[PDB]
């Protein structure tokens, strides 16, 4: 389910920038859905669309530029433009649209998960992210890198947040074929255990040691596994045995 | 080469057609508004027959009457009909024994099991049989085989797997399977008695049954000798293969063209469809064989007899045949269905892939789909039928009835539901 | 030994079907499951017991199966010390070892 | 270096201007050729499925693949021997099977692209953008155009239809399929087959794979098939500067027949197939093939019968020749479905100057 506005206000203003995902074109212009300011459809004209082949580029699905000309803040009629774009402004507009889309994606999985309204979620998100920081996707990115933006307002859901984090991003399988020929071995094994965990280690067979490495954002798990391997290697070199790593 | 007698195995596959064959004989029933025996007779004539022998037991009087009425009874015929009358219910071994007891068998006699209609010329086949016979002294009988429709899927009753040689055209193994119908035995068997003599082994399944046999004078004697063989395909051929009498040869003729025998209901329908189309090269109804027939050809595979009346504004599909003396109303949608002789069709009736026999009344506002109606059985107002619903003799389906898929209706006035009397079983009425 | 029963089976394969096996079980005085187990041990097969008839996976012939049967009749019925009729099933740890009711001796139930 | 001379069968007296010979089985070539081009050539030479539309797409795909595989030498620039390579490829193609109008257009486009970016940019940045651009172009002028055509057709089709069709034109197959599936109308499809390529048969097979009511006919059987039947559709290869229909084999006769029996013909074409080359007959430039196609005695392609005929070189004064591409009359087709929705065939080069 997808509904309601992205920002605080329902209808846009003068000069502010938007974008359409065009379903059908060529009659008057395009009366298609927006993804920057509400899912309710607005209209572009076939006059301020051509700048410099014209019927082939847009068509279906592709991202196309919009700027709000005239607003009827009474019943619901929105005027949009492509040619007016402030030069390179097109690129900026596109970026903004992309950000909006990403934000929408973010607040869709959580809506389906906790079975709670999307509009409310949007309201709860778009205040220290969409107003203070700039756009919300960038804020989210910042949070993922180092958490600072989410701390402003208290979250009603933590499981949802966790899910979101997971989506943004995890156990990685690791098998170490331990084939030691050492004098004292059990102690060495214990020592290894005492360093590698400080993650989830399980034993099925005597020579085989099964370990699953926890990853923060998938790519970080390579650094830990390698470290563990190194530690293991260190462990048995002093005593007099060997550990084979696949 | 000349002077050959014919023996036709009739009234053998009764109760196989589960609803019908109880009051009237099996072979007397019309294929396309005309009896099935006639086609067989024609085929025999084409082949080269000098005397006709028919085996009758179940409702023989009617058969005799038919023979009397038939064209071959008059002195102009090269072949005369003399029927074999035997005690009720016996296998093909017993029949053979009986024949032997009588003693008319001379040279290369023709034995045909069931009723078969095919387009392939027989003289060449006969010649081949003769030449092969001339090769070695101990040669037995000929079997007919034709290439199937690429992959087998509609064949469950008799999907015989033929392991064959290319050099001699001789059968190695015969086996029946219920594999596509019931997943219990998806299976293949090969015997090692003829491995180090043939060498050229070709394993095949896609071959259709014809059951037309050209047999030497040895066969009845063989039958007399070994009384254990009741059947002619399952036990006999296998026995021959496994050296019952040492050093003997059998034939399996291969033809690219169409040749299928009558066996079940769906198969029968398919055969009828083929006949309607231009599958058989010379076998067309418009030529008129029975002399009383007045069939004529029309565009888009449509057959019309003389005195056929059809009302204006009725959209027809593909492949339709109408018998003589018909009166059809308005607003009918007819698709791939045969209408019998002197049938009275009402108004606003949708038909698809169905079959209608001789003298049947179809009631107003009815839908018929892939189902068969037998002779003198009438359909009333608002009857909705599904795929493969066989209706028996003189069954009076009155006002308002609905029957589901594969519902069989009895013919004789026993074990199966729906009876010959007023209304088919939705409210209990009958004997 | 005339105790060997005729195997009334069609070599029609892909799945080995033995419908006559009940008779074999009866005549030789043996539980049907043991024979199945032996067959399994002999060749990598998988199936289920059905009341009289077997559904065993594999295309196996009417001569190698016959050979197997002949072997079974040569060592599982026969006891080396004294040829006795009464033999019973025992699961003794993973490999099978049957016991004779007349004396009480452990025989190799695999070779 | 390649292979030259040695041609099978008689050269004939009439219709001698275009190549009809050549490599069927490869023996000794230059040790620098990318094998994908060779494989494509091998396919095209012995193809039975393709018909004007997909060939160009295939070529484009091949080119893209080549670009992906392309590595710039350390000494010379990105375009120094590349042009030579391209020329060689073209020569190979011509030797195998003569270049179409669409193919020519594609070549021109490629040339333009080559001119656009001058040798100064690095390897991994240039071709990254090139391949994407080409993909975009493909998306634009081909698939989208086809979709548009389909949609135009959709509105143009009325109630109760009986249609006679011909060719292995992909667009027509798409159209018919669409009719069968998403429109759910009363559509009847009648198929016409030709001797050089089994296109009709393929069409029939495709129809069967969907589940359509199909009548199957030939070029000879036409006098009885009409005796209810209305629409006639054909597949075009290219429209010239004159306006005449320069298409495949058995179309023109069908069109004539349609004209005779009241109801006119409708033909479909793309907004890139248009040519500046001027010709008004089949004698000018024609796709001529080896007489090996007219050897099999009916039924199927792989049968091989020792019947009556099986000699060409040994026979004294015998000319067995067949043509693949034909020039149909201008006035006979009335409907043309292009990129600009609807229009007449007499427009000829209205899109050519528009580019």
UniProtKB/Swiss-Prot annotation, chain A:
InterPro entries on file: NA-bd_OB-fold, S1_domain, S1_IF2_alpha, TIF2_asu_C, TIF2_asu_middle_sf, TIF_2_asu
Compartments where located: Cytoplasm, Cytosol
Principal location class: cytoplasm
Keyword terms: Cytoplasm, Initiation factor, Phosphoprotein, Protein biosynthesis, RNA-binding
Chain positions with Phosphoserine modification: 50
GO-annotated molecular function: ribosome binding; RNA binding; translation initiation factor activity
Domain of life: Eukaryota
Positions of the S1 motif domain: 15-83
Biological process terms in GO annotation: formation of translation preinitiation complex; translational initiation
Function: eIF-2 functions in the early steps of protein synthesis by forming a ternary complex with GTP and initiator tRNA. This complex binds to a 40S ribosomal subunit, followed by mRNA binding to form a 43S pre-initiation complex. Junction of the 60S ribosomal subunit to form the 80S initiation complex is preceded by hydrolysis of the GTP bound to eIF-2 and release of an eIF-2-GDP binary complex. In order for eIF-2 to recycle and catalyze another round of initiation, the GDP bound to eIF-2 must exchange with GTP by way of a reaction catalyzed by eIF2B.
Note in the entry: Present with 17100 molecules/cell in log phase SD medium.
Assigned protein family: Belongs to the eIF-2-alpha family.
This protein's name: Eukaryotic translation initiation factor 2 subunit alpha
UniProtKB/Swiss-Prot annotation, chain B:
The keyword Oxidoreductase appears for this protein: no
Places the protein is found: Cytoplasm, Cytosol
Primary location class: cytoplasm
Superkingdom of origin organism: Eukaryota
Disulphide connectivity of cysteines: none
Example GO biological process: cytoplasmic translational initiation
Keywords: Cytoplasm, Initiation factor, Phosphoprotein, Protein biosynthesis, Translation regulation
Coiled coil: none
Entry annotated with the keyword Metal-binding: no
Remaining remarks: Present with 33800 molecules/cell in log phase SD medium.
Name of the featured protein: Translation initiation factor eIF2B subunit epsilon
Source organism: Saccharomyces cerevisiae (strain ATCC 204508 / S288c)
From Swiss-Prot, chain C:
First and last residues of each zinc finger (C4-type): 79-103
Subcellular location: Cytoplasm, Cytosol
Domain of life: Eukaryota
Record function comment: Component of the eIF2 complex that functions in the early steps of protein synthesis by forming a ternary complex with GTP and initiator tRNA. This complex binds to a 40S ribosomal subunit, followed by mRNA binding to form a 43S pre-initiation complex (43S PIC). Junction of the 60S ribosomal subunit to form the 80S initiation complex is preceded by hydrolysis of the GTP bound to eIF2 and release of an eIF2-GDP binary complex. In order for eIF2 to recycle and catalyze another round of initiation, the GDP bound to eIF2 must exchange with GTP by way of a reaction catalyzed by eIF2B.
Family statement drawn from the similarity comment of this UniProt entry: Belongs to the eIF-2-beta/eIF-5 family.
Subunit structure and binding partners: Eukaryotic translation initiation factor 2 eIF2 is a heterotrimeric complex composed of an alpha, a beta and a gamma subunit. The factors eIF-1, eIF-2, eIF-3, TIF5/eIF-5 and methionyl-tRNAi form a multifactor complex (MFC) that may bind to the 40S ribosome. Interacts with GCD6. Interacts with GCD1. Interacts with TIF5/eIF-5. Interacts with CDC123.
Protein name per the record: Eukaryotic translation initiation factor 2 subunit beta
Originating organism: Saccharomyces cerevisiae (strain ATCC 204508 / S288c)
Gene: SUI3
Residues of the full protein shown: 157 to 270 of 285
Curated annotation (Swiss-Prot), chain D:
Keyword Protein biosynthesis appears in the UniProt entry: yes
Keywords attached to this entry: Acetylation, Cytoplasm, Initiation factor, Phosphoprotein, Protein biosynthesis, Repressor, Translation regulation
Record's compositionally biased regions (Basic and acidic residues): 342-352
Annotated stretches, region: Disordered: 328-355
The organism's place on the tree of life at top rank: Eukaryota
GO biological process, one term: regulation of translational initiation
A GO term for molecular function: translation initiation factor activity
Compartment(s) of residence: Cytoplasm, Cytosol
This protein's GO CC annotations: cytosol; eukaryotic translation initiation factor 2B complex; guanyl-nucleotide exchange factor complex
Function: Acts as a component of the translation initiation factor 2B (eIF2B) complex, which catalyzes the exchange of GDP for GTP on the eukaryotic initiation factor 2 (eIF2) complex gamma subunit. Its guanine nucleotide exchange factor activity is repressed when bound to eIF2 complex phosphorylated on the alpha subunit, thereby limiting the amount of methionyl-initiator methionine tRNA available to the ribosome and consequently global translation is repressed.
More about this protein: Present with 10300 molecules/cell in log phase SD medium.
Similarity field: Belongs to the eIF-2B alpha/beta/delta subunits family.
Protein name from the UniProt record: Translation initiation factor eIF2B subunit delta
Included range, full protein: 237 to 593 of 651
């Amino acid at each position: 389910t997808s509904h309601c506005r992205f920002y605080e206000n329902k209808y846009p203003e003068i000069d502010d920038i938007v974008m359409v995902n065009v379903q059908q074109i060529a009659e008057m212009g395009a009366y298609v859905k927006l993804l920057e300011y509400d899912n309710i459809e607005g209209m572009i004209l076939l006059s301020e669309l051509s700048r410099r082949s014209i019927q082939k580029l847009i068509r279906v699905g592709k991202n196309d530029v919009a700027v709000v000309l005239r607003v009827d803040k009474e019943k619901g009629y929105i005027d949009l433009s492509k040619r007016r774009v402030s030069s390179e402004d097109i690129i900026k507009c596109e970026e903004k649209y992309q950000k909006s889309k990403t934000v929408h994606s973010i607040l869709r999985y959580c809506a389906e998960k906790f079975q709670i309204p999307l509009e409310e979620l949007y309201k709860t998100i778009a205040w220290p992210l969409s107003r203070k920081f700039g756009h919300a996707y960038e804020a989210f990115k910042l949070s993922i890198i180092d958490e600072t933006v989410w701390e402003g307002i208290e979250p009603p859901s933590k499981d949802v947040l966790d899910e979101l984090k997971n989506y943004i991003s995890v156990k990685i399988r690791a098998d170490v074929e331990v084939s030691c020929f050492s004098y004292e071995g059990i102690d060495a094994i214990k020592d290894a255990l005492k360093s590698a965990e400080d993650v989830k280690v399980k034993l099925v067979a005597a020579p085989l040691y099964v370990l699953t490495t926890q990853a923060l954002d998938k790519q970080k798990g390579i650094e830990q596994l390698e470290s563990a391997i190194e530690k293991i290697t260190e462990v048995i070199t002093k005593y007099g045995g060997v550990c084979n790593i696949t | 080469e000349d002077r050959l007698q014919a023996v036709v195995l009739t009234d053998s596959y009764e109760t196989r057609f589960m609803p019908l064959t109880a009051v009237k004989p099996r072979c007397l029933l019309p294929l396309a508004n005309v009896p099935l025996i006639e086609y067989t007779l024609e085929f025999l004539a084409k082949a080269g027959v000098h005397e006709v022998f028919l085996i009758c037991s179940s409702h023989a009087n009617q058969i005799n009457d038919y023979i009397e009425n038939s064209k071959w009874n008059l002195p102009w015929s090269p072949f005369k009909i003399t029927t074999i009358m035997s005690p009720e219910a016996r296998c093909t071994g017993d029949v053979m024994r009986d024949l032997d007891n009588r003693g008319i068998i001379t040279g290369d006699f023709i034995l045909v099991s069931g009723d078969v209609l095919t387009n392939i010329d027989f003289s060449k086949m006969l010649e081949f049989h003769k030449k092969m016979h001339l090769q070695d002294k101990d040669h037995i009988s000929t079997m007919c085989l034709s290439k199937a429709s690429t992959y087998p899927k509609t064949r469950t009753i008799e999907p015989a797997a033929f392991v064959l040689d290319k050099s001699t055209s001789r059968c190695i193994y015969y086996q029946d399977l219920p594999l596509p119908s019931s997943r219990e035995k998806t299976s293949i068997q090969i015997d090692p008695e003829l491995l180090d003599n043939v060498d050229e082994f070709v394993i095949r399944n896609d071959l259709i049954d014809c059951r037309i046999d050209i047999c030497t004078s040895h066969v009845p004697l063989i039958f007399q000798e070994n009384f254990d063989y009741q059947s002619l395909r399952t036990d006999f051929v296998k026995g021959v293969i496994s050296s019952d009498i040492l050093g003997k040869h059998i034939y399996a003729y291969l033809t690219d063209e169409y040749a299928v025998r009558v066996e079940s209901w769906q198969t029968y329908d398919t055969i009828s469809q083929d006949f309607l189309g231009r599958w058989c090269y010379p076998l067309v109804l418009d030529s008129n064989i029975q002399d009383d027939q007045t069939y004529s050809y029309e565009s888009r595979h449509i057959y019309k007899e003389k005195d056929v009346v059809l009302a204006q504004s009725c959209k027809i599909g593909k492949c339709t045949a109408i018998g003589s003396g018909t009166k059809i109303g308005e607003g009918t949608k007819i698709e791939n269905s045969v209408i019998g002789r002197n049938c009275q069709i009402g108004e606003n009736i949708r038909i698809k892939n169905s079959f209608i026999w001789d003298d049947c009344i179809i009631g107003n506002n009815s839908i018929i789909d892939h189902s068969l109606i037998a002779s003198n059985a009438t359909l009333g107002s608002n009857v909705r039928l599904n795929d493969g619903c066989i209706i028996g003799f003189n069954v009076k389906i009155d006002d308002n009835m609905d029957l589901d898929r594969n519902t069989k209706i009895s013919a004789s006035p026993q074990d199966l539901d729906d009876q010959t009397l007023a209304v088919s079983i939705v409210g209990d009425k009958g004997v | 030994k005339f105790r060997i029963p005729p195997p009334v089976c069609l070599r029609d394969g892909k799945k080995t079907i033995f419908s006559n096996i009940q008779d074999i079980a009866e005549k030789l005085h043996r539980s049907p499951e043991h024979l199945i187990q032996y067959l399994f041990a002999e060749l990598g097969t998988s199936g289920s017991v059905d009341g009289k008839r077997l559904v065993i996976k594999g295309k196996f012939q009417s001569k190698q199966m016959e050979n197997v049967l002949r072997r079974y009749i040569l060592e599982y019925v026969t006891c080396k010390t004294c040829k006795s009729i009464n033999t019973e099933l025992k699961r003794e740890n993973r490999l099978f070892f049957m016991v004779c009711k007349s004396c009480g001796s452990t025989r190799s139930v695999s070779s | 270096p390649g292979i030259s001379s040695v041609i099978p069968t008689v050269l004939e007296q009439s219709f001698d201007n275009s190549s009809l010979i050549s490599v069927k089985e490869l023996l000794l070539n230059k040790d620098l050729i990318h094998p994908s081009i060779l494989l494509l050539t091998s396919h095209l030479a012995h193809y039975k499925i393709v018909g004007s539309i997909p060939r160009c797409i295939a070529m484009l795909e091949v080119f893209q693949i080549v670009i992906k595989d392309y590595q710039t030498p350390k000494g010379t620039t990105l375009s120094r021997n590349l042009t030579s390579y391209l020329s060689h490829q073209i020569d190979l193609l011509k030797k195998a099977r003569p270049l179409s109008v669409t193919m020519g257009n594609a070549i021109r486009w490629l040339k333009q692209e080559i001119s656009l970016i001058d040798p100064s940019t690095p390897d991994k940045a240039a071709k990254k953008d090139l391949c994407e651009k080409i993909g975009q172009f493909a998306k634009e002028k081909i698939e989208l155009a086809d979709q548009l055509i389909i949609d135009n057709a959709s509105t143009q089709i009325e109630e109760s239809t009986t249609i006679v069709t011909y060719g292995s034109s992909k667009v027509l197959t798409e159209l018919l399929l669409h009719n069968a599936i998403s429109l759910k109308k009363n559509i009847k499809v009648i198929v016409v087959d030709s001797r050089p390529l089994f296109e009709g048969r393929k069409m029939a097979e495709t129809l069967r794979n969907a589940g359509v009511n199909v009548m199957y006919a030939l070029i000879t059987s036409l006098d009885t098939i009409f005796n209810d039947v209305d629409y006639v559709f054909l597949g075009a290869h290219s429209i010239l500067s004159n306006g005449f229909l320069y298409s495949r084999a058995g179309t023109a006769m069908l069109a004539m027949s349609a004209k005779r029996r009241n109801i006119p013909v409708l033909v479909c074409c793309e907004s890139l197939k248009f040519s500046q080359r001027v010709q008004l007959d089949s004698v000018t430039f024609n796709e001529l093939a080896d007489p090996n196609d007219l050897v099999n005695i009916d039924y199927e392609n792989p049968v091989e019968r020792r019947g009556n005929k099986g000699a060409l070189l040994n026979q004294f004064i015998k000319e067995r020749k067949f043509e693949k591409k034909k020039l149909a009359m201008e006035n006979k087709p009335k409907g043309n479905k292009i990129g600009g929705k609807k229009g007449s065939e007499g427009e000829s080069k209205d899109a050519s100057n528009e580019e």
